[PDB]
Amino acid sequence: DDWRCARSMHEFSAKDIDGHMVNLDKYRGFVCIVTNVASQXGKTEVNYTQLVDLHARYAESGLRILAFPCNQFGKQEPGSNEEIKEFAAGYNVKFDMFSKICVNGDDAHPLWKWMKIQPKGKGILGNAIKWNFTKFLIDKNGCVVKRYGPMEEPLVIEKDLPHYFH
Ligand SMILES: *CC(=O)N(c1ccc(OC)c(Cl)c1)[C@@H](C(=O)NCCc1ccccc1)c1cccs1
Numbered sequence: 001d002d003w004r005c006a007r008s009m010h011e012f013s014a015k016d017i018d019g020h021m022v023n024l025d026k027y028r029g030f031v032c033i034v035t036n037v038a039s040q041x042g043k044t045e046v047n048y049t050q051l052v053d054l055h056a057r058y059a060e061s062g063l064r065i066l067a068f069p070c071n072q073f074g075k076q077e078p079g080s081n082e083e084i085k086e087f088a089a090g091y092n093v094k095f096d097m098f099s100k101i102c103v104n105g106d107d108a109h110p111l112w113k114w115m116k117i118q119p120k121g122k123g124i125l126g127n128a129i130k131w132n133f134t135k136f137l138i139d140k141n142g143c144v145v146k147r148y149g150p151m152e153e154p155l156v157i158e159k160d161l162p163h164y165f166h
Helices: 043-059 081-089 110-116 156-162
Strands: 014-016 021-023 032-037 065-068 135-138 143-146
Touching: 014 065, 014 110, 032 043, 032 110, 032 143, 043 156, 065 081, 135 156
Parallel strands: 032 065
Antiparallel strands: 014 021, 032 135, 135 143
């Protein structure tokens, strides 16, 4: 793996929640929120509902959202990809759902390895993803511009968006 010398999210690919490989260069020109999700957390509802709200209000300006299920934080994403897809449909998710991945350790998805080492990808303590619903904001060139932690509701991202819609 060569993820350490990539300069953009657009260099990566990942399987969507149906199992189909997606080239992330399709997000060239778009502002993106990339987030790790889980279905069985106290903060699942607030995160899904607010992401849906942001997508509803900003998709017209080029906001896209990429949600990666992950079972590494309390084992609270135990379901199959098909089950998680249906779960997300219950919140009327219209953004992009991906297949379940790891975000930490040697088998972390390479996009996640890459985001964590970006200058604006470092967490408050360090690079490791700490819990469910970490959020990365990605500019139109696929560069990491901000990271928001598990404790930060997605609506805190809203005030930062206008700058990246130039
Ligand atoms: C996914 C998550 O954030 N989370 C969690 C929930 C449940 C379980 O085990 C059953 C585990 Cl290991 C982690 C949080 C959490 O949601 N805390 C709020 C209280 C709650 C809400 C709904 C369901 C169960 C608990 C936890 C992190 C540490 C302990 S619980």
